[PDB]
């Protein structure tokens, strides 16, 4: 969506280009400028996109270190079953 | 630098429309100094993207870790099975 | 390689500015906006190299799920492990 946006309309403005160069005119350098603009604003909501969506790698680390604290804790209770199970084993 | 942006791009459709209203080689420089302006802006919002995308790739190597204790701990839960049952059948 | 080009793609529109307001001119206006479209052109480049980039977000949500999922798996095991070794040796 964005990024389909975004080629077309550097497409579009490519054209414009060429057609200023083949024939210069203030009116074509200021259509020229108009779509540089358009372009400009697409830009800004790409990038806005991007930041909101980045959000979802705060969430994911939070959720990370909660995932390596549960580990940890399940690993000192699995060394507390490996001492009781031998010891209780080698008791009888 | 969202902020930042969309205010930088506000400016710049100011111009614009003066642009369009008395066009002026004054004003046509003035609006290309603008542009770059605001695409000085761009580029360094795109910086701190990338920089802070630096986040996704140690995300990952925690996820791997994690998925590796996990299957640690997984090979560790059937053999204490199969001990708890083979003691409990062993009376 | 896409900042680093960023950046200095700038750097080349930051000159040619310079020498616009110096000594304006239809050729150097036009120069001016080629080189703008050149640099929009960076731009719409390293958007879309985050955009194709930030698709590992997703896969790093995913596994974090899946992980979340294989912890809860393990606590319940553990619970069940708990209460057999207690009463296995209560037991005796
Ligand atoms: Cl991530």
Redesign the pocket.
């Known amino acids: 969506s964005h990024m389909g946006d975004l080629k077309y309309s550097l497409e579009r403005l490519r054209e414009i280009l060429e057609r200023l160069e083949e024939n210069p005119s203030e009116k074509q350098i200021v259509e020229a400028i108009r779509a540089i603009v358009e372009n400009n604003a697409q830009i800004v909501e790409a990038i806005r996109a991007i930041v909101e969506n980045n959000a979802?790698?705060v969430e994911?680390?939070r959720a990370i270190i909660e995932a390596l604290e549960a580990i940890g804790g399940h690993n000192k209770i699995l060394e507390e079953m490996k001492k009781q199970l031998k010891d209780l084993k080698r008791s009888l």
């Open positions: 979802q790698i994911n680390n």
